[PDB]
Each structure stands twice: as C-alpha cells, then as structure tokens.
Amino acid sequence: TSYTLNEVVPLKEFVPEWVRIGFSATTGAEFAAHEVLSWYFHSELA
C-alpha cells in the first residue's frame, strides 16, 4: 500500500547551515515498540 506527501519547505529559512539528522520516537500512556531496520542517506551541497 502507498502514501505520498509533497511540500515546498525552503530549508535555508528554518535550519542552521550545519545539522545533525536522526530518528525520534515516543510513547505515552498507550505505547508501541518503534524500530528501524536499515538506513541510507546521501546529500550533496554544490
């Protein structure tokens, strides 16, 4: 099954020149295990 979402987000405006990237998960009164099984990343700044 597939889900797609698209938005113009001008990153220069909101984030610093240097960033760290990652994953976050939380539980509350109700809960679930949240796991990542593989991760690929690539960026290119001209």
Partner: protein, 180 residues
C-alpha cells in the same frame, strides 16, 4: 561540493557512528528507539554534522534518505505516540516527550526550534492533530502542528519502506511510504 553518505543495512551491537539519546539502543540487527513501554523517548542521530546549506554561496543541498521501520503495538487501537525522521541543529537534545515526539515543545511557531521533521503519528492529540482523528504522515517545521498531513493506515508489526527526498532547485520535500 560537499557530500556525505552512509548506509547501515543491519545495526550491530556497538553502532559507533550513531549517537543515542534517551532509550535509543540497538538490539538484534535493529535500532530500537522505543520499547513497548509507557512514557519513554528514544532518539539516534548520525555522528557527522552534515552541511545542508552555505551562507557564502546561498546554496542548499539536495538529499535523499530511505529507511524501513516497524511499529509494534500490543494491538491496533492502543497505539501512541509516533516516530520522526528530523533535521535539527548539531547539538540537538530530546525535547518534550509524548505527543511532541521528542522533537518539539509547542503547537505555536517557534523560530528557535530550527528543526524540520517528517512525522508518522499514531495518536490523535486534540490540540493540534487533524480533526478527522486519523493516524497520519505530517511535515513539521518549528512546531508539532504539521504544515500538511496525509491519513495513513498503520499496519501493526509490518515493515514500512520510507523515502524522503529534498530537491534544492524547487525546495520540495517529498515523502513516500510503502508497506510492500
């Protein structure tokens, strides 16, 4: 040109190129952000800062990341709170838990946050989430109130393949989730 790339196909016991925060750890080939335990937070960051834009030149990076993740709740209705992929300042620490997913602190715009996150939110928080009350994908910039959402139906325990890409020429962030 500055480029940074990596891939981790299976997470090992001492995944030293990752920084862990909260309860985040690696167990059995997997990065587990959260255990099926109440009221916790876990985050994991790539070790290197990545140069996402440059003030001299005004250039912004093109990037793509893909990951497959699993959410495993005790049943399909009692599920909370969600999971994020995020881009924050280099010294980012966990923010508010629960409904704020460990990445934000309010529904009002906070320029000081400097965090953009793509959320996979499994709990309807009446104060800021879609009125339909459905589970959803959202794009968040400096707030837990998404700028745009898509309803998503959680498949409990199944692996979901996600791709997020940013094109600097048009500034469109695209997120695609597929349960194969």
């Amino acid at each position: 040109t500055e480029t940074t790339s990596f891939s981790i196909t299976k997470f090992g016991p001492d995944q030293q190129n990752l920084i862990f925060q909260g309860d985040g750890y690696t167990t059995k080939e997997r990065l587990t952000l959260t255990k099926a335990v109440r009221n916790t937070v876990g985050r994991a960051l790539y070790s290197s800062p990545i140069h996402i834009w440059d003030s001299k030149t005004g250039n912004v990076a093109n990037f793509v990341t893909s990951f497959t993740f699993v959410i495993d709740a005790p049943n399909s209705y009692n599920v909370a709170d969600g999971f994020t992929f995020f881009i924050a300042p280099v010294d980012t620490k966990p923010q508010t838990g629960g409904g704020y997913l460990g990445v934000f602190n309010s529904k009002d715009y906070d320029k000081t946050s400097q965090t953009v996150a793509v959320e996979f939110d499994t709990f309807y928080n009446t104060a800021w989430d879609p009125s339909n009350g459905d589970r959803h994908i959202g794009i968040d910039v400096n707030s837990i109130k998404s700028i745009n959402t898509k309803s998503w139906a959680l498949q409990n325990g199944k692996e979901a393949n996600v791709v997020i890409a940013f094109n600097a020429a048009t500034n469109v962030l695209t997120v695609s989730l597929t349960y194969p």
